[PDB]
């Protein structure tokens, strides 16, 4: 093989930078403009979302590698802010090039890259200190929410999903707790449902009802059995699944499999509940017992969801059927069989007033990619609203922030006489190009659009309002309410900031070429 | 994964919709030309073509672009109907209005509300000679008519525009408040007539009767089974394996001509002569069905008694065991109509009631395939004309209403924009142009006079681009509802923005 | 683009190309053709009438002129090349008209305009026939059956052909009367004066031997059941691992079928029409012995269309299974016959069957296959130029010559016209009289002596008169003893006029996915 | 359109003859030879009939095309 060093090196490290920063350049934002994506299955993905593309893209490099890598701390913990990361840490890397062409080292200026990142999350810092409760956060949950389902256009009228995001957060993650749960939301959705079919369920929803109607709909406070047992074909895991070969194996096993289920769906009872969940459900046969035996119960619980309904409801747990018994069963407030406004989709809930080990949003839409519309906006939106409902520190985005640290950067850079005084301040330009992408997207010249801010920097030095960053004309970032948690905003730089130095220190690289990835 | 960056992307995004339109605008518009499909990748074939489909799926779509509309066209067409050879050119002229517009260096995010606004005050102008045509019966008779006509125009149907422009209307003026799919039931079959179809009174199946069955059955009372026997009746002990080796498996059909009879157990119980079911018998089982006395009728069809339940006001049902479990169904006769050379067990209840059956008869199948989606495609825009009666006038002429105006617009509305929106209003007399030429025609006076001649007023008086001429929408009959219009506007609208914005594409 | 504009003039390249050479019609003419075919396959072409169907080509464009060739043919039975070779004539005026810069559209309403204005003179110029009487009938068949195969045997056929149609004529004059209820049967042994038109449904059923039905009261039956035996329908308890257990239920079966015969023997029916759906097999090969034993004919699965022709013109049915004896909806037979001429050859006639005024059955009888062939293709046609007189009467003129009067009285109508098309009927007006010239055009050197006069003379003899291509001379050329029936040209202009504008019809060509 | 314009006068022809009328030659509204009073003389298109036909007879003349290697100056 071989090993590529220095400007050869330096010319695989960039390079590979520079293109996927420019794909989701043009995919920045609200004005980002989408990435229709296809693979080789004949698929087709629209993708304005850098997590997306990335997860879109197998392509292949150390930096290929680092960028699927990078946004994706940024895409669960704080969400929005998985494209901007990214672009700039080319951005940061377009500059490293011109700046050891002028014979500043890697290294050099690799400090102050980081340096001047300081300057940039500590001006962040004095953007907006805020700090809201849950009740209060709501509104700039949802406010955020504004946003963070703005990108994916899934947003107004959503404020179901804002609202259903602003509870999913606070039930499992607490204010107080500051330890992320996206484990504990359960993100769920149905294809044939609407965007504004939207719900937040606080306990488990399980796909499957009772086995008819003509049972009661609903299961009071708890009394759910948490069962590993056939009523139906069981599928072991230890053995194989055969059915009957034979004319007299209908006649018997018809006649023996009946008046057990009769038992046991009694046994059920015996040991008792209103509900009776079963990882292996009530077969059509055993659903009429069920419905002779007078029980209501689930029929299909999944293998996991039967661990599901019993942490997520804090049912304490029964394993199967032989460890039924009447102090431990599965928990609920209540359970209902919930038609959600389109009946397609039809799920039993078992609801967690009680407490919620999994709350659920529950988004519907007409097809998947229109719930995925939905989920992931929502999600980004989940995720901000969890950040903010944490700690509501939040910022005016759109780069009014960072036009506002690029100047108080390069400034603070040039203090330290340090060749990263110049260095520094031309980390500072970077700060500069995720609003210019931006303003791109807007439809406006980024050039002229950015020192309109600046000028609005000039007048404020911090980010009130700002430019477009949907395309409007109303150029505000307080206004137009372009906002981002303050948190994650220096979590991109901190994410982006470093891969840059962090690719500055290794440059040393035994590769034949870059597509080793 | 292949990167695509914008360069070929917008210019892909230009081929895809226009590499097909180009093929479906022939088609599509008035007629001078039409798709001729000239098939082989799959064979040796020669085939006549007015179906977006037709011309969209079975030639390769396999252009990321082209994938949106051939998929975004054909729901347009499977919503509202004729909507693939719409979707399609009409966001194919929107890439040629995009690529000048991206040529001359535009964002397409500037492009977008510059054709997504004129998008709007185009449906408006659509909305202006969208002329509510409900006036009367007669009037939303004539008004259905006409909009039957329209979809079905442009494609090749021999007897059928005038048979379903009574029939499409005929299903709706019994509907009220919509159209029937419901109730008129296509039956096909070789009956030797060209086109030829009628709306059939009860509903006929398709059966040689024989072996010893008297043909014609008199004061039928159908006994209604949704579970008919294959060739085994299935119960419990309905299946059995004796097979040791090679003779039994000569000896193990003879066993199951045995269940055959068996069969003949549960119909004789129920008692009825008639016994009408879904699963068809056999010429040898015939024997003992026949000789048994009593007629059981093979395949009844479902929908067929659903005709007979909806019009005799009987009840049609699921899941027949015993003989009660479906309520018993009337007819006067089960007859067998001879047509040419078939033999057609004719079960008739009722005659042209609100579940109408229509017996299709064709030569091929492919003009009865046609024939079907333009009927599908008609009354759902008759059944939209039951909703919005306004005929907006079509032909191009609504195509310059939208291009006069939001060019009117474009001047004032925007002070950057005025870019895209007369660049919209310049997609839609494309269309228009197109076909003028394909009459020999000249368009461009056409587009520029007759628009602003009947944008000045005559909206009435528009495109005949068949002869070429200048004539009355309304009274050429050149015209359909204002949705499928402004419907087959919002997919082609969206479907060219869609891959405008789209400035990367990802290829695994 | 420039594919959509290429493609139609590569079709009209490849298309026309074709149509062309499909005229040294008629004539000595041009040397014979060993043709090693697309895959390497040598073999031996003339008679363009045929090397049109035989032709393979290749291309959308190409292959239209052998749905072309298709067309005329079965609809009339005569001018299989008049309907292609005038398409030679259509791509003439098509070009240079998109050469004069006609639009496609204006191009293909161009041929229905010609057309319109060609069934005029057509029928103008052709002479009424009786299609009831039996003189123009034969002489339309003579004719043709001059110009079919045999001019000798023409004679017996021509009433044989004769019969025919007027067994299944229909009232006055329509088009009807088709060949599907002529039945035509190849009887190995006989001469063609042995060639017998029957009236009734014979049958090309042949089965075993001889004075099998050949009786009185034998029906011909269609059976959709076959007969039963143990091993055949009923059950065998008896498996065979053993060559003595084979034995025991072959016996059974034998033993049990040889009860079921008799009862087909005293059904009336001598003859079942034994289902190709096969129950077990369905009638045992242990059975066709004993069916055949009661002088019942039935050959193993029997051929299909017999059972239709039974069903179609007898109306006969499938009865009850024979264990249950008949329910008799087999046809009524009171003969059904097996005739050996010369004492061979099996033909199934079955005489007092039902028949609906039609299905006349012409059994064309020969020693040779060639004797049978030249007989039946001859009488064909004189059924086909009957079938054209009854379909369209009247008679044109043959090989070509009347279309060139057509040509100059055309061009009167592209005179009137005064459109475009006006000049595109024009520009096709005049190409019609191509044919004769390309007829006479293969054979030689020294070249181009009769051709311009091919066409010259008929204009010089006018409107009415002009050069006979069969007979040589110029004449009134409706009857030089050279006619088709008004039918067979006014069949042939329709659908190359049609098959052509689909060209125009086309904007661009394609491939499926 | 040539076509076209042919196509009516055509028209013309089945209605008028040797005409006052025409195209319009001045590209006007109205096609005609008198409301456009375009014309020559007689003599002119009789002796712009000479010419055409006279060269079409004039290529025909010898059968000499027989040149050094020169039938061009």
Redesign the interface.
């Known amino acids: 093989k071989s090993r590529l060093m220095g400007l050869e090196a330096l010319k695989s490290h960039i390079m590979a930078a520079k293109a996927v920063a420019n794909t989701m350049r043009t995919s920045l934002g609200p004005n980002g403009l989408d990435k229709m994506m296809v693979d080789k299955d004949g698929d087709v993905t629209v993708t304005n979302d850098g997590a997306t593309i990335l997860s879109m893209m197998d392509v292949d490099h150390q930096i290929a590698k680092l960028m699927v890598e990078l946004s994706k701390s940024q895409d669960d913990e704080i969400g929005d802010g998985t494209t901007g990361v990214v672009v700039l840490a080319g951005a940061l890397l377009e500059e490293a090039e011109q700046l050891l062409d002028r014979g500043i080292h890697p290294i050099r200026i690799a400090d102050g890259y980081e340096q001047a990142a300081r300057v940039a999350i500590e001006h962040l810092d004095k953007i907006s200190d805020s700090v809201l409760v849950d009740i209060k956060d709501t509104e700039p949950l949802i406010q955020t929410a504004k946003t963070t389902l703005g990108s994916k256009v899934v947003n107004s009228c959503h404020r179901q999903m804002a609202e259903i995001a602003v509870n999913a957060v606070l039930t499992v993650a607490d204010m107080e707790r500051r330890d992320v749960d996206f484990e504990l939301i359960k993100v769920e959705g149905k294809v044939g449902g609407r965007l504004e079919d939207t719900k937040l369920i606080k306990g488990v929803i399980v796909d499957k009802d009772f086995s008819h109607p003509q049972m009661p709909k609903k299961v009071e406070d708890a009394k759910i059995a948490i069962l590993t047992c056939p009523f139906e074909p069981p599928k072991p895991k230890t053995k194989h699944k055969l059915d009957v070969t034979s004319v007299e194996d209908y006649k018997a096993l018809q006649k023996y499999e009946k008046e057990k289920f009769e038992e046991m769906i009694q046994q059920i009872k015996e040991t008792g509940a209103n509900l009776a969940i079963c990882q292996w459900g009530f077969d059509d046969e055993a659903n009429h017992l069920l419905l002779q035996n007078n029980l209501p119960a689930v029929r299909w619980v999944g293998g996991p969801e039967i661990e599901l309904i019993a942490i997520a409801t804090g049912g304490r747990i029964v394993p199967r059927f032989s460890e039924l018994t009447a102090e431990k069963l599965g928990f609920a407030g209540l359970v209902q069989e919930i038609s959600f406004g389109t009946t397609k989709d039809k799920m039993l809930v078992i609801e967690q007033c009680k407490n919620s080990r999994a709350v659920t949003i529950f988004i519907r839409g007409g097809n998947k990619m229109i719930i995925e519309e939905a989920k992931r906006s929502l999600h980004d939106a989940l995720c901000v609203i969890r950040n903010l409902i944490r700690d509501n520190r939040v910022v005016y985005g759109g780069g009014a922030a960072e036009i506002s640290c690029a100047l108080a950067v390069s400034q603070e850079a040039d203090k330290c006489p340090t060749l990263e005084q110049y260095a520094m301040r031309a980390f500072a330009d970077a700060l500069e190009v995720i609003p210019m992408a931006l303003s791109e997207n807007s439809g406006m010249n980024p050039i002229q659009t950015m020192t309109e801010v600046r000028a609005r920097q000039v007048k404020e030095m911090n980010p009130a309002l700002g430019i477009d960053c949907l395309h409007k004309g109303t150029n505000d970032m307080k206004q137009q309410h372009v906002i981002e948690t303050l948190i994650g905003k220096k979590q991109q730089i901190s994410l982006a900031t470093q891969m840059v130095r962090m690719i500055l220190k290794i440059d040393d690289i035994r590769k034949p070429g870059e597509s080793e990835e | 994964a292949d990167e695509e960056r914008a360069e070929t992307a917008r210019l892909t995004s230009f081929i895809g919709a226009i590499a097909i339109g180009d093929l479906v605008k022939s088609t599509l518009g008035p007629k001078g030309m039409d798709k001729i499909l000239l098939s082989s990748g799959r064979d040796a074939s020669l085939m006549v073509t007015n179906d977006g489909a037709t011309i969209l799926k079975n030639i390769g779509v396999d252009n990321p672009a082209a994938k949106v509309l051939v998929d975004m066209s054909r729901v347009q067409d499977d919503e509202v109907g004729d909507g693939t050879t719409s979707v399609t050119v009409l966001a194919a002229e929107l890439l040629r209005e995009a690529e000048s517009l991206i040529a001359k260096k535009i964002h397409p995010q500037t492009i977008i509300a510059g054709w997504r606004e004129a998008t709007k005050a185009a449906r408006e102008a659509l909305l202006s000679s969208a002329v509510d045509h409900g006036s009367d019966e007669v009037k939303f008779r004539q008004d259905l008519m006409n909009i039957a006509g329209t979809t079905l125009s442009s494609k090749l149907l021999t007897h059928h525009k005038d048979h379903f422009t009574k029939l499409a209307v005929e299903a709706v003026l019994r509907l009220k408040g919509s159209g029937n799919l419901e109730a008129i039931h296509i039956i096909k079959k070789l009956g030797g007539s060209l086109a030829d179809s009628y709306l059939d009174e009860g509903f006929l199946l398709d059966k040689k009767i024989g072996v010893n069955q008297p043909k014609r059955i008199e004061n039928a009372k159908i006994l209604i089974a949704n579970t008919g026997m294959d060739t085994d009746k299935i119960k419990i002990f309905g299946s059995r394996v004796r097979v040791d080796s090679t003779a039994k498996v000569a000896e193990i059909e003879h066993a199951e001509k045995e269940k055959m009879k068996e069969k003949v157990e549960r119909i004789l119980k129920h008692g009825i002569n008639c016994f009408i079911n879904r699963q068809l018998i056999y010429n040898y089982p015939e024997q003992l069905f026949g000789a048994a006395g009593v007629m059981a009728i093979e395949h009844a069809d479902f929908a067929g008694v659903e005709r007979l339940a909806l019009v005799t006001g009987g009840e049609i049902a699921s899941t027949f065991d015993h003989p009660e479990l479906v309520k018993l169904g009337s007819c006067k006769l089960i007859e067998e109509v001879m047509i040419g050379e078939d033999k057609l067990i004719h079960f008739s209840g009722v005659a042209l009631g609100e579940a109408c059956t229509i017996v299709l008869r064709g030569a091929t199948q492919q003009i009865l395939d046609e024939a079907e989606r333009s009927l599908h495609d008609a009354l759902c825009v008759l059944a939209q004309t039951v909703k919005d009666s306004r005929t907006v006038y079509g032909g191009g002429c609504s195509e310059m209403l939208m291009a006069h105006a939001v060019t009117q617009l474009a001047n004032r509305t925007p002070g950057k924009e005025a870019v895209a929106m007369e660049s919209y209003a310049k997609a839609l007399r494309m269309l228009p142009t197109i076909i003028a030429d394909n009459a020999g025609y000249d368009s461009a006076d056409l587009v520029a006079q007759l628009r602003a001649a009947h944008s000045e007023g005559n909206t009435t008086a528009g495109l005949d681009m068949r002869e070429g001429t200048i004539g009355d929408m309304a009274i050429l009959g050149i015209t359909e509802s204002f949705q499928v219009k402004r419907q087959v506007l919002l997919s082609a609208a969206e479907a060219a923005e869609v891959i405008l914005r789209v400035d990367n594409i990802i290829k695994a | 683009?420039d594919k959509?504009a290429q493609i139609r003039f590569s079709n009209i390249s490849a298309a026309k190309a074709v149509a062309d050479a499909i005229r040294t019609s008629l004539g000595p003419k041009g040397m014979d053709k060993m043709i090693q075919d697309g895959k390497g396959d040598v073999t031996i072409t003339n008679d363009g009438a045929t090397i049109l169907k035989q032709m393979q080509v290749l291309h959308?464009a190409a292959?239209?002129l052998v749905?072309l060739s298709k067309a005329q043919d079965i609809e009339a039975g005569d001018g299989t090349t008049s309907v292609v070779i005038i398409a030679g004539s259509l791509l003439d005026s098509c070009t240079k008209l998109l050469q004069?810069?006609?639009?496609?559209?204006?191009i293909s309403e161009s041929f229905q305009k010609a057309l319109e204005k060609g069934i005029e003179i057509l029928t103008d110029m052709s002479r009424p026939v009786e299609l009831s009487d039996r003189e123009t009938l034969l002489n339309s068949a003579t004719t043709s059956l001059n110009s079919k195969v045999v001019s000798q045997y023409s004679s017996l056929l021509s009433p044989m052909s004769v019969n025919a149609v007027m067994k299944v004529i229909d009232p006055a004059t329509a088009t009807s009367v088709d060949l599907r209820d002529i039945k035509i049967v190849k009887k190995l042994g006989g001469t063609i004066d042995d060639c017998e038109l029957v009236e009734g449904l014979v049958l090309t059923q042949k089965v075993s031997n001889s004075g099998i039905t050949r009786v009185e009261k034998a029906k011909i039956g269609?059976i959709?059941?076959c007969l039963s035996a143990?091993?055949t329908?009923?059950?065998?308890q008896?498996?065979?691992?053993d060559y003595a257990?084979?034995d025991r239920?072959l016996r059974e079966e034998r033993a049990y079928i040889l009860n079921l015969v008799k009862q087909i023997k005293k059904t009336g029916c001598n003859v079942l029409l034994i289902?190709k759906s096969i129950?077990?097999d369905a009638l045992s090969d242990l059975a066709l012995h004993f069916l055949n034993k009661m002088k019942i004919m039935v050959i193993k699965d029997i051929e299909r269309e017999d059972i239709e022709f039974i069903c179609?013109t007898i109306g006969t049915?499938?009865?009850?299974?024979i264990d249950?004896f008949t329910?008799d909806?087999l046809g009524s037979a009171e003969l059904a016959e097996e005739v050996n001429l010369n004492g061979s050859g099996k033909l199934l006639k079955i005489t007092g069957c039902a028949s609906p005024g039609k299905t006349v059955t012409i059994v064309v009888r020969g020693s040779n296959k060639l004797v049978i062939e030249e007989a039946e293709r001859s009488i064909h046609d004189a059924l086909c130029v009957i079938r054209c007189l009854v379909k369209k009467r009247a008679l044109i003129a043959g090989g070509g010559a009347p279309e060139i009067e057509l040509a100059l009285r055309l061009t009167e109508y592209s005179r009137?016209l005064?459109?475009?098309e006006?000049?595109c009927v024009r520009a096709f007006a005049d190409a019609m009289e191509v044919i004769p010239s390309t007829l006479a055009e293969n054979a030689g050197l020294n070249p181009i002596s009769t051709v311009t006069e091919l066409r010259n003379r008929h204009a010089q003899g006018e409107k009415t008169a002009g050069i006979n291509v069969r007979k040589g001379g110029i004449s009134n050329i409706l009857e030089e003893l050279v006619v088709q029936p008004l039918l067979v040209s006014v069949s042939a202009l329709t659908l190359a006029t049609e098959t052509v504008r689909?060209?125009?019809?086309?904007?661009?060509?394609?491939?499926?996915?």
């Open positions: 683009r959509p959308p292959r239209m749905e004069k810069g006609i639009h496609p559209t204006i269609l959709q059941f143990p091993k329908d009923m059950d065998n008896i498996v065979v691992s257990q084979m239920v289902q129950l077990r179609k049915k499938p009865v009850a299974h249950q329910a909806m009137t005064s459109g475009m006006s000049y689909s060209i125009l019809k086309i904007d661009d060509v394609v491939n499926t996915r």
